[PDB]
Amino acid sequence: SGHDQSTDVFSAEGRVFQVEYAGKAVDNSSTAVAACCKDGVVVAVEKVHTSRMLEKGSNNRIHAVDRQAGICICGLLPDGRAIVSRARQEAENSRDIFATPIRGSVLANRVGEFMHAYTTHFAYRPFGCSAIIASYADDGPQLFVSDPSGTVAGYYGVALGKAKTVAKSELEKLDFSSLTCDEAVGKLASILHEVHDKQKDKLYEVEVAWVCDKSDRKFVHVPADMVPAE
Template identity: 45%
Template sequence: MTSIGTGYDLSNSVFSPDGRVFQVEYAGKAVENGSTSIGIRCKDGIVLAVEKITVSKLLKLGANKRIQTVDKHVGVVYSGMNPDGRHIVTRSREEARHWRDQFREQMPIPTLAANVASYVQLYTVYNSVRPFGVNTIIGGVDDEGSHLYMIDPSGKSWGYRGAASGRGRQTVNNELEKLDFDKLTAAEAVKEAARILYVAHEDNKDKDFELEISWVTEANGRVHEFVPESLLAEAKIYAEEQLDADVEG
């Protein structure tokens, strides 16, 4: 970066001569080094999944969840710095609770995503704080249907059919583009999410990982929850079989 060492990367409230905010770009690099996460919007709901690298054999399996519930009908998965992700989840829950207290109804998911994106963007304009080193994928089902949004460290928010973040983002995006989201059911999306994460993990296969997958569907009453263990086991078997078939092919 041409402006490193000239002072333009010391504050997130200063633009470089070529119009860049280096602190935001550095936050994006933190995301690229994080675990790979996926969001899929299918015909009957949404699916969230994450590849959680096992950094130590001493860690308890299932602890430190990367997928969390914001409100009954909304879930979140994130890539990047874990403390930053937890803070965004807390803020999202506050937004949803305040809306419910004021209007006595669930918060529309597009409004939730917009409010959280605005909050994230505030951390890019003041010198006393730093940008969040995390990409957040928000997904759920409300009265208007299923929704999937991704918010990056700059506060930019887009609606997606399929979203990916983390170190395997490019590989995941290539696989997501092959899916027919209009015909894909939530149960099928769970298996595809597992397969795609196994494919992305091939670039980091010397490390063990846990697979976390959740969903919100019309069939389960629009409740964000982790998928049943039986379906998760099926998804892992399907992913391994597809990966072996690709290797043999």
């Protein structure tokens, strides 16, 4: 009825549907995965190209927020670019005012309050996006996920997207304590080529990015020849 038309309406049992309807925009989106590898964090996503003529590098869902942190989004691409352009502004404030790099748990708590502030007012709609904050600050390697409700949580590994239930069981076979960033790019990319089917889309490729001690604590994308072929 009229109990699911905006954000400032609790249900008869205390639920907000426009937040929960925004969570179905992430569950119908492409598959995301991540891993914390005891000296860094590796994040991989699958770009579903809708045409053969797209340039390699188009629609990259991984964006660098600071030198040590970067947010990969899962859900709607243009809604997540408002989250990226906000968390960059949160990370520029700590460098310019407090003369310090932003911590991993503090950048994620600023993302979860920007995403929550658009779920409490009638004129605004929640994001169709789950943001994955991968950071390496002076509190070690961090891996956070902010859902459209504004809930942040530290993870060791995460699967998000359509086949987030099959890819979650594929993460339970990894270690995360002896796991390094050297092997996990080959492992996490091999999750995506097994969890995802080619009988719906013909064009699908993977985009991996890390931040670890080997890359001098810098959030970078891959050199193109480290990813497995298929």
